[PDB]
């Protein structure tokens, strides 16, 4: 178990947001089976109930949509498989 | 003069900043400010991305107050077999990866040696390695062999 800052909560649900586009792009290619595509459709009902959260807890001018955060999410998933900040260099703002 | 340090997530931090400071001291730096070991860190220039250049120095690579620079953490992880030697020339393996410390290492080897872990000191390739630091700092192979050398007292 890792220590984590403050920032982590948003982190993580960006991330998972990143995730979420992942999982829904690889259901496109008939390649997700149907306990898959029941875990997608798992992650994204509460990744919405933890960004209502989420959003009601920070400034109105912080507050983003599930879409917004999905492509923060990719940026930060392309830097962690290339392991190269090119690939992504909006992922290291909140 | 500050250099803003900015992880993934959006997490920063401030390191101060020296003209003729070389990037490997700038990972010690964030080392010792964050708890991510240096040779674990891959940092970079923000906007372009392009990768610091560890024997230059920062201001030399276009660094200045108020610059930042992205760090990417690189765990290795990879657990790989290596020998330890004792004093009597007879090796017992062992399972370590680049991440752990030499101090993990000694706990083994005092184990199996039955030695305690301040009576003796580990070398690779003639140069002794310190407990805090992490085995990845000397560049362990598979299979190769570190020393066991017994102290006096």
Not at chain 1, 79 to 84: E, I, Q, R, S, Y
Request: proline share 5%; with cysteine; aromatic share 6%.
């Amino acid at each position: 178990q890792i220590e984590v800052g403050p920032g982590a909560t948003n982190a993580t649900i960006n991330f998972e947001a990143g995730i979420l586009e992942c999982y829904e792009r690889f259901s496109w290619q008939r390649a997700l089976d149907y306990p898959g595509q029941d875990r997608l459709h798992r992650l994204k009902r509460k990744l919405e109930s933890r960004i209502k959260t989420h959003n009601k807890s920070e400034p109105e001018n912080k507050r983003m949509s599930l879409e917004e955060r999905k492509a923060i999410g990719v940026k930060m998933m392309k830097v962690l498989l290339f392991m190269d900040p090119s690939a992504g260099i909006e992922g290291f703002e909140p | 003069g500050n250099l803003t340090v900015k992880m993934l997530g959006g997490e920063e931090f401030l390191v101060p900043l020296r003209d003729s400071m070389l990037a490997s001291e700038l990972k010690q730096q964030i080392a010792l400010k964050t708890g991510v070991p240096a040779f674990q860190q891959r940092l970079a220039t923000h906007p372009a991305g392009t990768v610091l250049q560890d024997g230059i120095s920062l201001i030399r690579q276009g660094l200045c107050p108020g610059s930042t620079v992205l760090l990417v953490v690189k765990n290795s992880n990879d657990p790989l077999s290596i020998l330890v030697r004792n004093n009597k020339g007879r090796s017992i393996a062992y399972e370590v990866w680049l991440t752990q410390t030499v101090a993990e290492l000694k706990q083994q080897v005092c184990q199996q040696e039955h030695v305690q872990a301040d009576l003796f000191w580990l070398t690779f390739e003639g140069k002794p390695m310190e407990d805090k630091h992490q085995l990845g700092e000397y560049g362990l192979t598979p299979q190769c062999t570190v020393f066991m050398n017994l102290r006096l007292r």
